[PDB]
Amino acid sequence: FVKKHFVLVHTAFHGAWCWYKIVALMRSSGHNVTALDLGASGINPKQALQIPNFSDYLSPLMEFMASLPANEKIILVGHALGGLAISKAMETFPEKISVAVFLSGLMPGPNIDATTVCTKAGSAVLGQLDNCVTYENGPTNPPTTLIAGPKFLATNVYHLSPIEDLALATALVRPLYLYLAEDISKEVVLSSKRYGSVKRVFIVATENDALKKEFLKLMIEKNPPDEVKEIEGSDHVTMMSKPQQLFTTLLSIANKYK
Amino acid sequence: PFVKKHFVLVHTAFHGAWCWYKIVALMRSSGHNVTALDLGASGINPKQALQIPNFSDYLSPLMEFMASLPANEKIILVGHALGGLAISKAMETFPEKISVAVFLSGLMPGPNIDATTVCTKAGSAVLGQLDNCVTYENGPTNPPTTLIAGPKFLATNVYHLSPIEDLALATALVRPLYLYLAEDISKEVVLSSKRYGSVKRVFIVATENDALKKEFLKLMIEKNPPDEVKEIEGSDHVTMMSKPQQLFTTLLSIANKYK
Numbered sequence: 207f208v209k210k211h212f213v214l215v216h217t218a219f220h221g222a223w224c225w226y227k228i229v230a231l232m233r234s235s236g237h238n239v240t241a242l243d244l245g246a247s248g249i250n251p252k253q254a255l256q257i258p259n260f261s262d263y264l265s266p267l268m269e270f271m272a273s274l275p276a277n278e279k280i281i282l283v284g285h286a287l288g289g290l291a292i293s294k295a296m297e298t299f300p301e302k303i304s305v306a307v308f309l310s311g312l313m314p315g316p317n318i319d320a321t322t323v324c325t326k327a328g329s330a331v332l333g334q335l336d337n338c339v340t341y342e343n344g345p346t347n348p349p350t351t352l353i354a355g356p357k358f359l360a361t362n363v364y365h366l367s368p369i370e371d372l373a374l375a376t377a378l379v380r381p382l383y384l385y386l387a388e389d390i391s392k393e394v395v396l397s398s399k400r401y402g403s404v405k406r407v408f409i410v411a412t413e414n415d416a417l418k419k420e421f422l423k424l425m426i427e428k429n430p431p432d433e434v435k436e437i438e439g440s441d442h443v444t445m446m447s448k449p450q451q452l453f454t455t456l457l458s459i460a461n462k463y464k
Numbered sequence: 465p466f467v468k469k470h471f472v473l474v475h476t477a478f479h480g481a482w483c484w485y486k487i488v489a490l491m492r493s494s495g496h497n498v499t500a501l502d503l504g505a506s507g508i509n510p511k512q513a514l515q516i517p518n519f520s521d522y523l524s525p526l527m528e529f530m531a532s533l534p535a536n537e538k539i540i541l542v543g544h545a546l547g548g549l550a551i552s553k554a555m556e557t558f559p560e561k562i563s564v565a566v567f568l569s570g571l572m573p574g575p576n577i578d579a580t581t582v583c584t585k586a587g588s589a590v591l592g593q594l595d596n597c598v599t600y601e602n603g604p605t606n607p608p609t610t611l612i613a614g615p616k617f618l619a620t621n622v623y624h625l626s627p628i629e630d631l632a633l634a635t636a637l638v639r640p641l642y643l644y645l646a647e648d649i650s651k652e653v654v655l656s657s658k659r660y661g662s663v664k665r666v667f668i669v670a671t672e673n674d675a676l677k678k679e680f681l682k683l684m685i686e687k688n689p690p691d692e693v694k695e696i697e698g699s700d701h702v703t704m705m706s707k708p709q710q711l712f713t714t715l716l717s718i719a720n721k722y723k
């Protein structure tokens with residue numbers, strides 16, 4: 207038994223809270239775990255309008271990474287949109303990361319742009335079901351924030367999870383600032399010397415959405431990781447629908463890339 | 465003979481609407497209406513504790529909700545621990561809108577045992593306990609400003625009979641509580657027999673509560689008698705975590721009895 211430090215980074219609308227099943231399994235197995243709230247997520251004190259720059263969204267992860275002595279290595283796990291956060295962390299602090307894990311994560315590289323993966327990810331959320339946008343920059347400006355609706359969550363995100371986790375999410379999801387493509391492209395710049403030197407595992411976890419699976423496959427083709435793993439029977443929130451399986455998989459990954 | 469009901473759930477200190485998630489799912493699945501509220505600077509409420517030094521602002525999300533309720537709609541109002549103060553004020557202001565009020569290990573002040581007596585006693589069971597700590601944002605010459613629940617205190621006194629994942633959830637979500645002045649609470653929560661006292665009232669005891677001692681709960685029940693006292697065995701302080709199904713069936717029963 208070697209004690210390891212997992213750092214968990216959530217997706218859009220979510221927070222540290224969404225990892226609670228995983229955090230519990232990690233803590234009782236004796237491992238260190240940090241689940242972070244990104245900007246204006248979970249109980250982070252910022253509101254979405256206060257973090258209109260993508261660097262502001264990422265700062266809780268970047269501050270945490272900065273506070274790490276270089277000898278204290280981590281397994282860095284990014285879920286969906288959280289892939290962009292972990293990619294930035296990989297570029298800035300490549301030495302501190304044993305292995306980065308992309309859980310159906312946006313995984314841009316040199317051959318597939320950060321703005322490319324974003325526009326595609328956004329198309330599957332913007333205008334879907336009961337999702338709605340706000341216009342705090344006024345009616346003649348692009349929409350400012352996106353709010354995940356309860357039907358969208360039930361149908362597209364939590365559709366294989368226990369009903370109580372849907373209720374939990376409905377009480378906790380927060381708006382996402384609609385970051386500009388230009389902002390993101392400038393912020394998430396990746397090089398093969400820094401980002402590319404970090405060991406990288408992709409976990410494919412999706413069901414009943416073959417187009418989403420194709421998007422994940424495309425990112426894997428354009429930016430080949432060191433290893434691809436699969437979890438069956440997962441909805442969009444694998445930490446909710448397949449917690450034991452995700453835990454086992456992360457431990458296996460951690461043990462392989464010490 | 466299904467009758468659709470409206471449950472309104474009010475959390476305790478440090479918590480938010482999120483703590484009721486198991487109960488919310490059970491209620492929504494059976495077709496009942498349920499609102500789980502965040503009080504000021506709780507859960508995902510946008511205020512920070514320091515921004516809300518007045519107890520009125522802590523309570524405002526409930527009071528605004530109560531005011532916006534449609535004509536002739538009655539609610540089952542459920543308050544957990546500190547949430548008891550909030551529902552008591554709601555009972556005094558809008559007695560007509562409440563079918564029955566449920567105090568779940570709740571602070572239950574009355575005309576004979578006022579809000580400040582109850583608060584001072586509650587404070588002693590939380591302040592200084594294990595790894596709980598206070599902040600001094602107004603400097604050392606002023607009273608402490610906020611109270612922060614510690615992970616050890618949560619594990620030992622609050623979540624000890626709950627699934628370990630619920631403790632993990634809590635530690636990622638608990639927020640500071642502003643240390644509201646006794647004088648402020650006294651002015652905000654004043655209860656009369658013809659208003660507060662006219663609302664049907666049930667107290668639910670958690671048998672293994674290690675946050676609020678039974679001697680204090682016995683004092684409140686005697687000096688401010690409810691219409692009924694119910695019991696959930698093997699429950700820690702957070703009944704909605706440790707005994708969710710039992711709490712649910714009890715709430716339905718209460719709702720059916722006083723409808």
Ligand SMILES: CCCCCCCCC[C@H](O)CC(=O)OC
Nearest residue numbers: 476477545546583586587644675
């Ligand atoms: C004087 C005003 C300060 C209010 C004192 C806090 C009382 C908290 C009541 C419970 O004993 C603690 C709890 O609910 O567990 C999370």
Ligand SMILES: CCCCCCCCCC(=O)O
Nearest residue numbers: 217218286287324327328385
């Ligand atoms: C143009 C920037 C795109 C912002 C929208 C990102 C939504 C991603 C949601 C998700 O992957 O769970």
